[model samples]
Target chain A: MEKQCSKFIVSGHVQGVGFCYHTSHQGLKLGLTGYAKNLNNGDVEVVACGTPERLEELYLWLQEGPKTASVRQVRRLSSELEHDYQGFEIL
Target chain B: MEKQCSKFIVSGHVQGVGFCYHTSHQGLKLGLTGYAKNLNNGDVEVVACGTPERLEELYLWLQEGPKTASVRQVRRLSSELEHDYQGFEIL
Candidate 1:
């Protein structure tokens, strides 16, 4: 299967609410490897690499995030698949 | 020795220029574990955990970043030392 990678910037009420951890869990469940982290500008950033379908699954979850998170925006950043990540991580 | 962790938000021309990989290399050399990734707002977010001295060293390096990067700001976010990451990564 062809691999796919994408960078997502999740905005709004993402920080201070376990969003990173939640994203990591969801990504791992889908057998994806990458990371999720809190941005300084009150947003959460996620970089996931996996099958195209799996990435879409993770992206859908990112829209709602955890129940506590009020996801406002999900922006896809331009990127090429390069790194071979080992496991999902919360940074 | 006590373990220390800190979240750093690095700004400026950090996004497309191998800043995340450089930071990961530096952090690993200093025996730290965590991750560095790009934000949608043209910044890089780093979450590192290790000795306080090593984290300080990483912080100083983040100020200049790689030669290709034009670093402008480095902000420390509010976070507690938690997750025990195994290795430094670029996400």
Candidate 2:
């Protein structure tokens, strides 16, 4: 895949809500690679490397997150920089 | 108190533990300002704005974090930047 990376910092009702797990699950099925991890400031930071289309799908999913999550805001920063990722992970 | 900012990127068993909470609790008592946030790469990012002595106190505490955290590395970037913080916050 011609890969690019996008990073998101999600806030509000995200931390401790399995946000990373769910995000990675969605990303994995989309054949994306990267990681989702909890940010100490009560946000879930998701970084994925994949085709633009695949990443967009993951981005949409992050808008609502898991049913248990009350997602308040999702901030995305896209980069065209080169990258390689082994697999999607919930870090 | 005179204010400066120090940023720390803490790696290893830090994200899910009460690292941010404990760090902020200590920062608060030391009358520091700034935030502790999670990075997408599985590190805890702590930014503290306070006097050198006070920030150093927080830095020392972060070396070990909470009992639950097994912090592997603490990377610090200190600069003489002017800053004013309202109160110490977990974020």
Candidate 3:
């Protein structure tokens, strides 16, 4: 009965505008594991894991984004366990 | 009639956490005019002016932030004239 969790969905004018890059940048700084990418459906998504507090901090920043993005919404739901991504990346 | 504009106040765990740095970075990339800084009360504030679209995009990103910040709220108000900040900076 160990705790496990990962993933989040960010929606809005968040693609082709450096959202992934910035998110990854911050993730690296936080020493978190995860990745960010643009979805075919026109949203941005990131799946990551770290101290819940740190993750919460990162979550706050996701609401706003790089100057070029307009993040309309952010929906987060936890998963089973940490995947322990090798490094933060933009996909 | 000419339009006059400027300013916004951001509240929460936004200071000393690279919020201003990242905000300024994005502003430079977008060639927007503005400045970001940490308030004595522990919030981060940014005052900038640009095309409404660019400003809105930047505002959206402001909600979610760098890995270390927790932005509780953002309050924006229009001003008299664009300050025309020469370059984006963290103060």
Candidate 4:
């Protein structure tokens, strides 16, 4: 399968709830490579790379994150075959 | 979509080449939660959870891992809805 990538912007009650940490865990679990970070706007930005189907799973997870997260929206900024991240990180 | 899980045993030239690290990165990037570890049998064991589609993508990635990895076989031990891991780890 061709490699792909995407950026996810998760909004709502996601900050300070171990969202990034869990997100990183999720990403690594899927055999993907990227990073999940918290933005100043109370949203979690996730940049990931793998296959389209794999990315879809991540999107679904973002809709309902960790037990503590009350995700409101998960925006896909872009999906392409551009970047190939090295590892999953929490930033 | 219904959540799913699977276990993968990757063999060949996979160890001592940062295979686990890169596999964890791939899992996290796909947003699927799981773990990839080096087994005593010179194979990498990856336990992952997410949508079936996502797992399929991960399966594909396992066939051709990181740049340093020369994967020979990627065996799927099982695929089901049995486990929902909290995070992705390299064990």
User: RMSD of candidate 4 to the true fold?
Assistant: 11.7
Best by lDDT: 1
Ten consecutive residues with minimal summed lDDT in candidate 1 chain A? A79-88
Q: What is the C-alpha lDDT profile of model 4 across A1-91, one tens digit per residue? A: 5677899888888899888888887776566788988898888889988767767877887886455788888888955548667778888
List, residue by residue over B1-91, the lDDT tens digit for candidate 4: 6777898988887765557867777888888997878899889899988888888888888885444567888888866557677677878
Off by over 4 Å in 1: A1-91
Give the per-residue lDDT digits (tens) of candidate 1, residues B1-91: 7787899998776765677878888899999999986554667789999888998898888885446778898898877868898898766
DockQ of 1: 0.07
Q: TM-scores, in order shown?
A: 0.52, 0.51, 0.48, 0.53
DockQ of 3: 0.09
- Evaluated at residue A51, the lDDT of candidate 1 is 89
Report the error of model 3 at residue B77, Å.
Answer: 36
Q: Give each candidate's interface RMSD in Å.
A: 5.8, 9.5, 4.7, 6.8
Q: Candidate 2: which stretches are off by over 4 Å?
A: A1-91
Query: Please, what are the lDDT tens digits per residue for candidate 2 over residues B10-73?
Result: 8886764677777777888888878877555667789998788988888888885445778898
* lDDT by residue (tens digit), candidate 3, B1-91: 1223457788877887778887887765543667897788887778876666667767787876444678888888667655657667788
lDDT of 1 by residue, A1-91 (tens): 7776789999988898878888888889888988886777887879998888999888888885456788888998886544566687776
Q: What local lDDT does model 2 show for residue A59?
A: 83
Arrange candidates by TM-score, descending. Answer: 4, 1, 2, 3
lDDT of 2 by residue, A1-91 (tens): 4766788888888877777777877889999888777877888878887788998888888885455788988898754323345577676
